[PDB]
Amino acid sequence: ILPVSMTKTSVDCTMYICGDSTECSNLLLQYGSFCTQLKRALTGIAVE
Amino acid sequence: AYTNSFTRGVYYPDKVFRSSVLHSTQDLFLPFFSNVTWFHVIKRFDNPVLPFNDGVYFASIEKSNIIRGWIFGTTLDSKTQSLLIVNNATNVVIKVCEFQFCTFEYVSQPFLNFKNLREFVFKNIDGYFKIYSKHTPIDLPQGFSALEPLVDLPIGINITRFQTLLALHRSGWTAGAAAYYVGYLQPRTFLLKYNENGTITDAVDCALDPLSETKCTLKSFTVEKGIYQTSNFRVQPTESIVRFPNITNLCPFDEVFNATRFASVYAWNRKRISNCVADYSVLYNLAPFFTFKCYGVSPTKLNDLCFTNVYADSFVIRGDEVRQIAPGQTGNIADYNYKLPDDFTGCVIAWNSNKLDSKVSGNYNYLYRLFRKSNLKPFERDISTEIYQAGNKPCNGVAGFNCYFPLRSYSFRPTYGVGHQPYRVVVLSFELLPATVCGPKKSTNLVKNKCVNFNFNGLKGTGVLTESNKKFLPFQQFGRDIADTTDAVRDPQTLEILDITPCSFGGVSVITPGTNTSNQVAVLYQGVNCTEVNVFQTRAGCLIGAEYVNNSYECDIPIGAGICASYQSIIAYTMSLGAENVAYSNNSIAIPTNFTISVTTEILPVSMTKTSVDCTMYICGDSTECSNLLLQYGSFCTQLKRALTGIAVEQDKNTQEVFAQVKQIYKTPPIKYFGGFNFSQILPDPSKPSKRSFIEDLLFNKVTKGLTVLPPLLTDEMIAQYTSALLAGTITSGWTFGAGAALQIPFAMQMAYRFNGIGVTQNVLYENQKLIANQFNSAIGKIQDSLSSTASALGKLQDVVNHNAQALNTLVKQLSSKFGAISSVLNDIFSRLDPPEAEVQIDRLITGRLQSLQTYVTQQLIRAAEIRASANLAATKMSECVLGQSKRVDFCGKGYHLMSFPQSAPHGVVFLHVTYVPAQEKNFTTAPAICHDGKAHFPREGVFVSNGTHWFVTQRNFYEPQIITTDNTFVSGNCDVVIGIVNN
Ligand SMILES: *[C@@H]1O[C@H](CO)[C@@H](O[C@@H]2O[C@H](CO)[C@@H](O)[C@H](O)[C@H]2NC(C)=O)[C@H](O)[C@H]1NC(C)=O
Ligand SMILES: *[C@@H]1O[C@H](CO)[C@@H](O[C@@H]2O[C@H](CO)[C@@H](O)[C@H](O)[C@H]2NC(C)=O)[C@H](O)[C@H]1NC(C)=O
Ligand SMILES: *[C@@H]1O[C@H](CO)[C@@H](O)[C@H](O)[C@H]1NC(C)=O
Ligand SMILES: *[C@@H]1O[C@H](CO)[C@@H](O)[C@H](O)[C@H]1NC(C)=O
Ligand SMILES: *[C@@H]1O[C@H](CO)[C@@H](O)[C@H](O)[C@H]1NC(C)=O
């Protein structure tokens, strides 16, 4: 056996951190490009 | 009546310059392609007053200056401030005085098919009035115009109303024919582009269109054809649902209030009320209480607040003595019978009961404490009927002088007045120390087939609440799944379970072809039902804007679950694999007669933008305080630097393995006599000044602080020279220069050796030398054209250069991540903050940046390993493809390998592999064996095929018949094993 694929998992940083909480998500948006680079890395995982 | 506002309102945000860079900003902006009302001027007069709101983009088709000035105000008196602008005979006058149709004045420069335009901006953004002016000689027409900033005036006033003013003509009045338009600014993000001079050329609002969002994400006005992640679909909970037991039972409030006879005030009855639901809304609606006072609790939060326990204190007192039941208030009842704490958080309820608690002969059953020894401490209760010693003589249990019974009876008679009527009083003590005491909370009816927010016995979440036909054990309240997430819950009063499935949120992507091709877009939603969001439902989600096709074509833009969309509107479909072809055969053979020598670009990243980070300089700069603070945090910085040095030495050694595979440097003579195989685009021309290949030139012009970039040990020139040496070896001397000296060997016989490698005799080459040469050179020309005209030819190198680039870019922007402080320079923190807290915040900020750098170098090592493996593959395939022939399939490109030619590239390599690709098979005849004289004759290497007339021995891959001699056939057994063999 050679494993071929994982389950590609594009995790939204905002959903992961605050869910649908508008106040928490808005506060998260202040924090910077953390979620941006994380999502880009995860999408890189998926496209790979 | 309505018309398109088109593309007006774009302006420079402030007085900063940007050179050929794209910035996205978030302020109040005018929407694009907006449907704006059209005005008319001609006996109907339209004189409306436009509301300022948050601001307006006000442009005028103005000639000869009919429009003069505006009036801003709300009340038109001295309480408010009004701004007035006029343009008298010389100049433009800016004033602020309280005219009844002085505080501020200003002076500007003198001003001294549609043709003239005057654009103005009314912005009041945090008290700022940024001024812009743009006039250009020319339904707002199709065109482009930006508004340069002139003055940013911090007026600091609120604007809501504005209106333009006209003037008649004196020379009798004449009104011109024109139309003006007013939009509105909203918070939205644009895509600014600046030219090589530094002016705005093209602008796109992000959320204007799906294509606009694609442009906003990709930071370009040109976008390749493909699928791009945009956002995530947020399913909004339709309704809020709450479900509690709170069954009728509720709390036994009635038994306390509606009791027959209460206990007296001195021995007031304390009832613990708990494990029930409050219904205080009845008490307010009761309207039968003479006194209703709540001190520490207000009715708004009273009915929806939880407390540990609530106690029901009830008794009967007189009307005049009701008022002593109050925190702070004292007296004969509030000191000896029952004292409220001065912090009484609760309610006081009292009502008249002269009907029940008054007997005609005198109701003497309700008593008080008249005269008590001292005052009472909190939570003290004097029920002692001890005879008072009001003097010196001890009371030996008998009454008399200085010996009185501490309890006296109320004179409750119906004839008595209002104050002497028995007023039944109930006090509910509110205190909090577990929450078994709650109010109604409103059990809201549930919904079905909708993911909403719910409150099931104190549990909250989002997911669809649908019918479920599972039977779970009665005592268990709710369940969970393998991943511990809740999947069902029991609602009280029905005892039925509802299966909870995760709500239907998913990502948002836009299927959009290249802007050079079209501009129609469609939106894909990840795992979203089409009934909650023309509209088509995929196996992967809901597709909006495209039309599904029963016919299936070849996939080009993956959508999801095999759905793929191609251009016609943009049509989507389940992807078609291809053409069902293979015709399995028993007695049928086919012998190829022709082929193509395709040449395919193969791309491998080799190097990265290697860097070393001074940790102290990175985090602090030249700040001595910050350096002194940081150096005490340990050798994390040393780990960082040394890991980066490992990266750099790894990069150099990969480069050496790739290029300096041979220490001896062979050279290409200016006399490039290859017998008609011109390699000018790959081999640097001695006439070319910088000794670089034209393909390298195409590559290089196609491809595009506080940190360093170390030069490669082998510069671009030296790498090119290494590649030239490799080419010279593998061409003039062939593959052996890897194993030692470049043993010279003529090129035609080297290719003959290669065909012997793939199973072809050198005679086949010699008969095909010229034609394969022409095919190869034409293929080289196709390579030239493809690399020159193909933006996707450099996908891998261009993206790895990217990955490095935006890695460093997120690195530098991380320094711009403020983390909630005032200034990243330590001086402002120290000057406006206490030094002790300034130090701690400094530590927090620097440790955040340190974590960021560690994370960056973490992924830098990740690509270090990845591209290191890739470059190992690159060296291996120069060994197997340049330094020899590879037996490996799909390793020197697609198919049997023939030859390879390395080429230099920025931080990587590019190859032109010669991969053998057959074509045009021809279908033939064969027999298992040929039996001659009862003897089976087999070719040593070939296969007997017959075209229909004669038997021939030929090649396994091609039809080259020859005479079956005694040197190709061998003596081995007989023919008696094969079935159906023929005698030939
Ligand atoms: C494969 O087919 C091509 C067909 O294009 C052959 O090339 C032609 O050969 C004839 C014979 O001299 C020329 O007159 C044509 O000009 C050629 N056409 C082209 C486009 O080059 C080629 O010879 C065939 N090769 C084999 C091995 O069968
Ligand atoms: C090789 O010969 C066989 C002869 O049976 C071919 O099989 C048929 O080819 C015709 C040609 O179009 C088809 O219409 C038939 O459907 C084929 N038969 C079957 C059962 O599918 C075969 O196609 C030939 N192969 C080549 C490459 O020419
Ligand atoms: C007395 O009993 C009635 C039932 O008829 C109830 O509705 C009411 O709330 C009770 N009185 C008070 C003060 O709660
Ligand atoms: C090979 O290519 C070069 C450059 O495209 C061209 O000048 C030359 O004529 C071609 N043919 C030969 C035989 O060199
Ligand atoms: C089969 O090949 C031989 C060899 O050239 C040729 O003489 C013969 O005519 C061919 N048969 C047919 C039917 O073309």
Swiss-Prot record, chain A:
- Which span of the parent protein is shown here? 726 to 773 of 1273
Q: What does this protein do?
A: Precursor of the fusion protein processed in the biosynthesis of the S protein and the formation of virus particle. Mediates fusion of the virion and cellular membranes by functioning as a class I viral fusion protein. Contains two viral fusion peptides that are unmasked after cleavage. The S2/S2' cleavage occurs during virus entry at the cell membrane by host TMPRSS2 or during endocytosis by host CSTL.
**Intrachain S-S bonds:** 13-35, 18-24
Output this protein's name: Spike protein S2
Swiss-Prot record, chain B:
Which pairs of positions does the record mark as disulfide bonds?
97-102, 206-216, 251-276, 294-347, 306-438, 395-403, 451-503, 530-542, 555-564, 615-637, 620-626, 881-892, 931-975
Annotated BetaCoV S1-NTD domain ranges read 1-218
Residues on Extracellular side: 1-984
What happens after mutating residue 920 to H?
A: In strain: Kappa/B.1.617.1
- Keywords assigned by UniProt? Coiled coil, Disulfide bond, Fusion of virus membrane with host endosomal membrane, Fusion of virus membrane with host membrane, Glycoprotein, Host cell membrane, Host membrane, Host-virus interaction, Inhibition of host innate immune response by virus, Inhibition of host tetherin by virus, Lipoprotein, Membrane, Palmitate, Signal, Superantigen, Transmembrane, Transmembrane helix, Viral attachment to host cell, Viral envelope protein, Viral immunoevasion, Viral penetration into host cytoplasm, Virion, Virulence, Virus entry into host cell
Question: What InterPro entries does the database record attribute to this sequence?
Answer: bCoV_S1_N, BETA_CORONA_SPIKE, CoV_S1_C, S2_sf_CoV, Spike_N_sf, Spike_S1_N_SARS-CoV-like, Spike_S1_RBD_bCoV, Spike_S1_RBD_SARS-CoV-2
Q: What is the effect of changing residue 371 to L?
A: In strain: Omicron/EG.5.1
Positions of region (Receptor-binding motif): 352-423
What is it used for? Main component of the anti-COVID vaccine Chadox1/AZD1222/AstraZeneca; in which the human tPA leader sequence is added in N-terminus to enhance protein secretion.
- Documented effect of changing residue 138 to V: In strain: Omicron/BA.2.75
- Sorted alphabetically, which Pfam families does this protein's record hold? bCoV_S1_N, bCoV_S1_RBD, CoV_S1_C, CoV_S2
The effect annotated for residue 367 to Q is: In strain: Omicron/BA.2.12.1
Write out the GO biological process terms: endocytosis involved in viral entry into host cell; entry receptor-mediated virion attachment to host cell; fusion of virus membrane with host endosome membrane; fusion of virus membrane with host plasma membrane; membrane fusion; positive regulation of viral entry into host cell; receptor-mediated virion attachment to host cell; symbiont entry into host cell
Q: Please give the superkingdom of this protein's source.
A: Viruses
Chain residue ranges for the region called Immunodominant HLA epitope recognized by the CD8+: 363-371
Phenotype upon changing residue 261 to K: In strain: Mu/B.1.621
Relate the outcome reported for changing residue 172 to S.
In strain: Omicron/BA.2.75
Where is this chain primarily localised?
Answer: virion
Task: Provide GO CC annotations from the record.
Answer: host cell endoplasmic reticulum-Golgi intermediate compartment membrane; host cell plasma membrane; host cell surface; host extracellular space; membrane; plasma membrane; viral envelope; virion membrane
According to the UniProt entry, the coiled-coil residues are: 798-842
Give the family, as the similarity comment puts it: Belongs to the betacoronaviruses spike protein family.
**What is this protein identified as?**
Spike glycoprotein
Q: Which organism is it from?
A: Severe acute respiratory syndrome coronavirus 2
